Amino acid sequence: PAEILNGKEISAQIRARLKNQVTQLKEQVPGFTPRLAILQVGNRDDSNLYINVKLKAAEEIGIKATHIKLPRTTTESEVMKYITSLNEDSTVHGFLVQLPLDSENSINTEEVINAIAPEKDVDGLTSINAGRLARGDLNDCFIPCTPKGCLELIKETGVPIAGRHAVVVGRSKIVGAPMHDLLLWNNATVTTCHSKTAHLDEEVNKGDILVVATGQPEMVKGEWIKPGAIVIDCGINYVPKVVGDVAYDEAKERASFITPVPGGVGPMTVAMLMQSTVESAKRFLE
Amino acid sequence: PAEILNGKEISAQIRARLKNQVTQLKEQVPGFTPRLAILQVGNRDDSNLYINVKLKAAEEIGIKATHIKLPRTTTESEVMKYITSLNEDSTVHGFLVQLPLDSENSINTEEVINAIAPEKDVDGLTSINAGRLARGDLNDCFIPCTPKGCLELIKETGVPIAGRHAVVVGRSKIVGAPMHDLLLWNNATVTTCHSKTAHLDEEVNKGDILVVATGQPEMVKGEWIKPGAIVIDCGINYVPDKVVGDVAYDEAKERASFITPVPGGVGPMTVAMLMQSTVESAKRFLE
């Protein structure tokens, strides 16, 4: 049986450190506070939940987090007015657009995301920050929050990354593709799989490190797991109960470390966003 | 043995089609002509060689190509002034900075590259264009010219890329990393290897498609190659004797279904893809 990576506990420790930094930073600079804005389009239930968990974390730490919720009938030009304003408001240190946009109109997601000023792009979703991470310029960019949090979970095992084979299942803009880049520049040998991969089971079996971000409940079976692998499950699926993308019961028998769902990647995602927000607040003080 | 992917023949076909494309544009819009600029820092022989090949190809196609060469002792502020001037000259449609910079002073390559207007970044080296490619937004960016040319060589086989396991050995900003992205958004399963990869022979043996860009002459031995693999050798290594690639061509040819020779493989495809990107930005400028 694998040792469980306790993300709920690990994040708690991170947020305490962030609170101390924000507490300390509010003294060294009186009247100053990190400010986060979260923009939402539409009213998805899962977007509501995740945004509120983020507001909740920001509250604990002392970050001032605003939530602007736009209606489903919002146009692309309406959204761009808000991004423009947030870019220009010098009191706002970071902001993000919760994805996907839930609009009945046609909105170019990529156009919206890429209007965000890169120095405020705490979610790391602009092409500018993605291109730096994709090319190995890691100390110059915001890195996406779920990948940042998966990397921290992997170090918690103590097992070095350099020279191990990492398999990443999924290549989405927010998780899988930046996760590949993060592991690579941490000097793993990385294979990316996706919905056109043949023999996915045999590919998954190659992974000393396995990160699954597919959105298909429990599709990655435990038999597929290389014995002793570090298994990281990014899935959160509501099913007949909350399950991940990895069949947790079987995989725990093969993994050496595993993240449970919930309480694994999820809280780490939120903690890493808070960390990037404090980092941009500090960078702003220069 | 493998069929030879003959880059000389394929590049010559692309240049001719480009030439006719330029001719028709010039007929449709009299006086107009695609304009490329190449900036160099220092006096490296290999850069001199490669830039000259690009000048010759542009001249054949009808691209007006200017070459600006700065001394080994230039400052970053001097280089930034030229990049700004090229960004601002409306008669220049694309330009590149031949890499590596050859300087006595330390110059931030990333700062220099990233000052290029993305719409003129025909080499696809700005962070903006890399981020578009890395995330599959392929319709808005210039792709770097060597990965573009590898993709054409692979498509010359007529074997679809989707579903195959591709291995890219090397992760540089100009070749290896963009090659991984190009193959991923053509729906390969991609493994990227580098100098920290253990058991490189076993990773190479997974490749239905193998792209090697290491600058380590003949380091990828032919016995590692999966039988039937498509082998793409981006290496141009001058060894004592002669040019060799990054793959042991002798044993590799016995196992691959297709293979690029060195020279006459990727090299001419690189130049041709740069010309294609230049013609493309010129057309976009007309819009």
Ligand SMILES: Cc1cc(C(=O)N[C@@H](CCC(=O)O)C(=O)O)ccc1NC(=O)Nc1c(N)nc(N)[nH]c1=O
């Ligand atoms: C999937 C997820 C889970 C949780 C979480 O907290 N999960 C807990 C249970 C929480 C509870 O119910 O208390 C657990 O799994 O244990 C927080 C965040 C996300 N994901 C995102 O927010 N993704 C995302 C996006 N869609 N768009 C942009 N722009 N940026 C983003 O990062």
Ligand SMILES: Cc1cc(C(=O)N[C@@H](CCC(=O)O)C(=O)O)ccc1NC(=O)Nc1c(N)nc(N)[nH]c1=O
């Ligand atoms: C390695 C190489 C070879 C040749 C070549 O001429 N090869 C043929 C001969 C016949 C012919 O080319 O027509 C052969 O090998 O057979 C052309 C180009 C390169 N490489 C680059 O130029 N790399 C590069 C760089 N260093 N910096 C920036 N910014 N952009 C870049 O693309």
